[PDB]
Design a protein around this ligand. Sequence first.
Ligand code: SF4
Ligand code: SF4
Ligand code: SF4
Ligand code: SF4
Ligand code: SF4
Ligand code: FES
Lengths: 226, 208, 586, 180
Amino acid sequence: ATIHVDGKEYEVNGADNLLEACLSLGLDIPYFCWHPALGSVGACRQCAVKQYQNAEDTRGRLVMSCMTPASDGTFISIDDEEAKQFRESVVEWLMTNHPHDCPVCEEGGNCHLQDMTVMTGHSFRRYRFTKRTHRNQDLGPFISHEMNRCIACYRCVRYYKDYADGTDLGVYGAHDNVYFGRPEDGTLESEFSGNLVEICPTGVFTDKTHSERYNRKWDMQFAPSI
Amino acid sequence: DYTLTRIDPRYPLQKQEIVTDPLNVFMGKLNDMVNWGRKNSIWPYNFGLSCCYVEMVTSFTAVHDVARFGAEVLRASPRQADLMVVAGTCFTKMAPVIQRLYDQMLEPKWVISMGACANSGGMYDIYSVVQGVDKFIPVDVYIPGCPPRPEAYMQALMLLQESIGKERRPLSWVVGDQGVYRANMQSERERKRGERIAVTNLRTPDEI
Amino acid sequence: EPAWQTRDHLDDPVIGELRNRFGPDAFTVQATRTGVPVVWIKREQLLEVGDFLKKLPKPYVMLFDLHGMDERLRTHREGLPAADFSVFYHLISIDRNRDIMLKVALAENDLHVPTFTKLFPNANWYERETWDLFGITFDGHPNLRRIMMPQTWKGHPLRKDYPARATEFSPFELTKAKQDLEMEALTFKPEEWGMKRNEDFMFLNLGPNHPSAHGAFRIVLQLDGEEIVDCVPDIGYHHRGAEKMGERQSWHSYIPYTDRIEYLGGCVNEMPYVLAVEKLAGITVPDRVNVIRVMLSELFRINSHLLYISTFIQDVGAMTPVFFAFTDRQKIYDLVEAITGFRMHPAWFRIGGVAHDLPRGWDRLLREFLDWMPKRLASYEKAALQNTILKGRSQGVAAYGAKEALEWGTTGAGLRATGIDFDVRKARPYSGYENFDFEIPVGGGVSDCYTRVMLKVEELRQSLRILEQCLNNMPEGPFKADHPLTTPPPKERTLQHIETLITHFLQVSWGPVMPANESFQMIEATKGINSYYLTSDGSTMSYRTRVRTPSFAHLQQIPAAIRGSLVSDLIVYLGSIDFVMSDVDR
Amino acid sequence: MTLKELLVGFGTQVRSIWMIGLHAFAKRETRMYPEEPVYLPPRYRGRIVLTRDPDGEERCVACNLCAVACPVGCISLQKAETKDGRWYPEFFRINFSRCIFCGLCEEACPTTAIQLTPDFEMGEYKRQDLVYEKEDLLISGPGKYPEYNFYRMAGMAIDGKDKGEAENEAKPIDVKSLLP
Ligand code: SF4
Ligand code: SF4
Ligand code: SF4
Ligand code: SF4
Ligand code: SF4
Ligand code: FES
């Protein structure tokens, strides 16, 4: 297929969506809800680009790149002013309830939301009201739960139910009182519950074994191994 | 609480051994008066290397007046000077020159490291900088700071002064023990920790 | 259009002249944020382009910079010629008040460039610098020896594969044999350095230890009786590896390292680095930030000029003005400690602004220093500068005209003593220096030591005028920019907002992500023109940090003016240059 | 030289001698250390200490921002957790032989726990005593910032501070609540 990003022509796989096609080319598009192994559901509304109908179209329309197929002759813009404003607005709307917990959080320096707020340029806060809070749950000796830092991106429920076929974790609640976790306090039953520490873009699910002797990612001497 | 050092040609060519204090009250009074005369007239070596030397000569001026301690002669030859102040960075090219200037000095000699560069290499963890002046010469008094303020250099000067005031050196080279005795004084960290911990409030940084 | 916008300068008349001379496809323009036209030229046409620029109607008489760059690890090389190494030449045309940057591409194996010394004599040390740190060989150089490191060294540090840290190397062992061979390496033998020794020429060695404030270095002297017939400076005794260090630290953490490039500038040295970083990030600082930075730069300039005058007077032989001028430096240090919090190296500038706001009461200390200064300066002049013995020591000693200053790259009072009115603060205004009323002094046309001293005294008086103008009308507003890349964000918003805390968390730990671009900024330092050239590959680190300093050009200018004099004139000339070894070596 | 330059030179030497005598009849500019204590500004960058909460706890949360923001890398620490869940440094050491007193750690501290007091007398005999452990850094008060508390702003629940009890935090609404 043939796409045009900011007037520049690119050749991409026609079956894939615009988000993974543009991320394959090295272009930077924000995203929270979409995962490469889980598919697109269009939840977080963070991946907005401005799609034009034809070449000589100036108005366009704000679409989501994860739900937009990369068909032949597609015309989109990433760094459009309205698209950038909407993406910063989505970051800000996720910021209206995020707790002031980054120094005391295990995902600090490894947080997708941290990189994604810095990337979108959002640094000024104009929210002066209260922030919602949630009680935590005891999710066994491996996963530590902190429901305050969630952004309701629905990655955990999608992975744990559709992919891993786990049955003890889910979403409850309502409009802004969504609760992602077990129906009651107890250990997570699935044998693939460890991948929630990286499926979750925030620090809701953290490695408690690492959280005992914690240090940041830049302090880690890493190696590849089997 | 004393250390015996003797030199006899990896640098330095000397070994330290823990020895108790031997210190005739006439010899003790002679040693005390010799140490008093040595500590009240310390003749430094004018050695211009880096930033810390500029702050050393900022200590050397009228607004600070290190001359009050009898430490203002500032001889340009290593033979005429008693104290070597490594006030700068020990570069790889300048390390043998520093070693030679230390070698040409004569007993008694003392070494004051000025700045993080001369202390441990400091902020320059680079290929051409030797990480610390203690890698090749012994050091008596260390000063931290980048640069240390001039009054800190006088503080280290007094530190060296009571270090000299409680050390034993041979009066003559023909009679007595020739080894150099240096007191293992209690360090300033746990000595000042009695009043450093009790600090409660400081002036807020929004005022002058 | 803002001053940080990416332009290629295709409308530059020099570009059209090169188009008409060499054809349309002989070269390739490059769009950067350096503010100068950057032209990628072929290697064999380099000398032809140099001749064409030298013989322009308004010629490019100055070789401002000449260095190399390791382009092996550079990923974002879109629109650029394929190269594993590059060599860039920054050439300044004073008459046009412009400059150009010619870049020559080199492969990984064929690392030879035609020499450039036949057009500019400063290309000798510039090409020795390029060979010393990159290994690039220049065909036809008189002597391509290591200038910063000893000849008994392996590898080239500014290559991208070299280990930067001494911890990667073994700990420095100094055995008896190591000390013997290191002292043997410093032994000077005339045939290698090009002395070419009549059986009467006395050979003299000054240094490397230097009982003065301006670093430590060595000069080898050939003496026909008491006449200096030939001399070549020996530098590299203060090499701190600052550029490779700039490849190691982040954008934010590098500022204390820019502090100690020239240790008599402080904020004056911090200014071009943060200006180039703000050019990279597209940050437009508010006017209050500009006035604060101007105030600190002028204060440190007065400090450096006071120290230079004191050390020169002490070199002549009067020892009391060093005490008085250091008391004045203590007053300046009182104000600087009150504002920033440290005496010589404040490290107080930040990307997009300053570290803190001003304390309450800085105007009182500024007023006190401003009424303390001028009577002391007048007493300084009437006590030592108008002395006839000092005039006999200094007037007519190591003099050169405009041609010798231009061809050797001399800037500052060394260039302004020739009557060439070239100051950065007036030719290319930066940081709101146009909102101040001040004069640029010029000499009669002869660069004596006395002419440079009076030029710096008049510069001190003009800096006092700028300080008074800043104190009288001081803007009220922010002390940091509103850009999201301002590092760090304001502290109270970090302390009680969450996205500001996140921006702080990712800007002090990983570092800010500057987009992949090139930037350049030169300023009028306390000793001349100091320039920062920063190339970023889109990471949180500087891919290339090039620092050009005027003391390098002055030290290379030294043998062209001191030839045919005695040794006391050499000491007076050394004391009257206003250099430091950290400026030359860095 | 001519006779005129000789008389001018003699006059300038006499003038310089007279001005040196006039400065000799002036007041001393010397600040007499150590009898006269040095006045240092409040924001003077000197000895690094670790401050305390107004409640009496240590203000550090072992977030390791100062260690990575330190360009010399002279900070080492390890995070530890109490039974309630608050974060403190298990140990904390600064290599003062390496520290350049650049103040980047205090600027980068998100809890204002680490500060630089106006104190400069840090000279030492041995380099081993220049490593200041956590015993030599924690002071009895809040230092230059007298009323800040990170845990009052923090969203994490600790002892004496339940969920929703922080600044600008509503009470936790349960998902089983009958209100729509
Ligand atoms: S808990 Fe994590 S993965 Fe689940 S919706 Fe919230 S942010 Fe997404
Ligand atoms: S998960 Fe929340 S508290 Fe943790 S680093 Fe990310 S934004 Fe901060
Ligand atoms: S410690 Fe700092 S002030 Fe002293 S020589 Fe090193 S860089 Fe300069
Ligand atoms: S002042 Fe600078 S060098 Fe010292 S500990 Fe803090 S960040 Fe490190
Ligand atoms: S930056 Fe502050 S809170 Fe974080 S580890 Fe350092 S001292 Fe502790
Ligand atoms: S990534 Fe497309 S809406 Fe979430």
